[PDB]
Amino acid sequence: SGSVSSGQAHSLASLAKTWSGPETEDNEGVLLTEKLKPVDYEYREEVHWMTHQPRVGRGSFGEVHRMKDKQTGFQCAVKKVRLEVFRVEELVACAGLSSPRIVPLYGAVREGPWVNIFMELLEGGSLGQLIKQMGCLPEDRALYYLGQALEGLEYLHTRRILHGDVKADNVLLSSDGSRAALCDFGHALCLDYIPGTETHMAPEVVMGKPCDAKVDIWSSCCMMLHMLNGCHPWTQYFRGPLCLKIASEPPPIREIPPSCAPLTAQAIQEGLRKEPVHRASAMELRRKVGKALQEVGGLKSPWKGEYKEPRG
């Protein structure tokens, strides 16, 4: 027996809130696309759907896999999360939102102490995977992707939603590399913040100050440094715990490659102001990034091909 239904995002959000003892096989959830089909109110791994192939990635609180609905044959992505680490915000924050810059959820189904979150599969892979493959990305492609991420952030921030862990591993690419989109709202907050990836955390985060949407802007510029250098900020200069260094050192603008053009360096600096009051908004930074991209001649580099040496 189970209570898995087909429905809309608001219904899934209401159920998710009830997910927040002895481990059960309780099966409940809401599927948001007709391509994933409950069978007699159940939807269970190995019975109605299955994972296959190597891991597709790591996500917040759980691993991400390719999966297939056994009946429909539909392929999508799934993140499996233990119930005790599941954050409800992942299934509430984007309920009723739709943007080309946000990867759509396909639903979520609990099975005992596991929550399975379903999402559109993007064959282009993550931006993190691209950086690893290519060593690092040229300035024009980096600006192009940062701009699209910022477009997604504008959409969220106007709705008082913090993404909470903006980084290359959480930005997915279309099959031809032309479109980037934010995914993974495990650290999201509808404006207590649960910090994301240490290297990308803003000073106000490590200082335990009230966090707002500016946290995502600092993260996005750490992601920009990652694209450009091929490594996360701080890591090549510092050793152990980074929290005190983030709070105390100058913002990591020394990691901007000397080859970057003036508007590029300026944009990164504005997104990395230590005091969030002085830090650019998504709206502001997106405009600056667009001008920076125009000033280097627009997007010209092919999305793959030439390995570029990262900073050693």
Ligand SMILES: N#Cc1cccc(-c2csc(Nc3cc(F)ccc3O)n2)c1
């Ligand atoms: N498709 C795809 C793909 C490729 C590489 C990484 C990721 C990725 C990174 S975080 C991530 N989270 C996530 C994936 C889901 F399927 C459902 C909820 C999620 O939060 N996925 C997805």
